[PDB]
């Protein structure tokens, strides 16, 4: 029971930590995330 209660609290806290923050420039971040790998993949 103690382990399960701790597990529930841990899941809740980590999930609330995974939520996106208002103000994240996800568009610039996505452009960088898609352009950085483009520099390694082959031209031919």
């Amino acid at each position: 029971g103690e382990a399960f209660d701790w597990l529930l609290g841990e899941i809740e806290s980590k999930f609330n930590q995974a939520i996106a923050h208002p103000g994240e420039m996800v568009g610039a971040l996505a452009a960088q995330s898609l352009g950085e790998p483009a520099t390694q993949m082959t031209l031919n």
């Binding site: 029971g1 939520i19 208002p22 103000g23």
Partner: protein
């Protein structure tokens, strides 16, 4: 290509109502990534109810409250007595399995190919392992966790 992508998406941002919008205030996504989660905290996991067969799914996820001796091996005496005697608890567990079976069909239509690799926020198996080691769980002894407590 990099410059073009940047200039195309530069002002798209997560707003305080949690929608993703551009400079015009038009809505690009009602929630970021369709789930409103940041990409740093998510990680690879496995859906355990996607690939198994119906028999295996039944055998692994249907709580068997009829086998008295198996429950005696898994649970403590008061928990075994409450699970075997009470019918409210048994109906709760039965509906738990039905809900998991519905979830199974939802996953089967979401992932039409049998790929259980998913990217989700919390690594539940690692958290369970952490709880096992933090509280010194003995895997060989019967547990004092009521399955109704798990459901609730």
């Amino acid at each position: 290509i990099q410059r073009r992508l940047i200039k195309s998406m530069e002002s798209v941002m997560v707003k305080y109502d949690a929608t993703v919008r551009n400079s015009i205030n038009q809505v690009v996504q009602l929630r970021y990534g369709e789930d409103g989660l940041a990409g740093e905290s998510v990680e690879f996991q496995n859906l355990a109810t996607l690939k198994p067969s119906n028999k295996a799914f039944e055998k692994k996820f249907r709580f068997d409250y009829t086998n008295e001796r198996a429950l005696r091996r898994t649970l403590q005496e008061d928990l075994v007595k409450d699970v075997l005697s009470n019918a409210h608890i048994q109906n709760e567990l039965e509906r738990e399995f039905e809900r998991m079976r519905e979830d199974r069909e939802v996953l089967r239509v979401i992932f039409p190919t049998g790929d259980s690799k998913v990217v989700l926020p919390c690594n539940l198996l690692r958290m369970i392992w952490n709880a096992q080691k933090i509280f010194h769980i003995n895997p060989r002894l019967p547990s004092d966790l009521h399955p109704i407590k798990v459901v609730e």
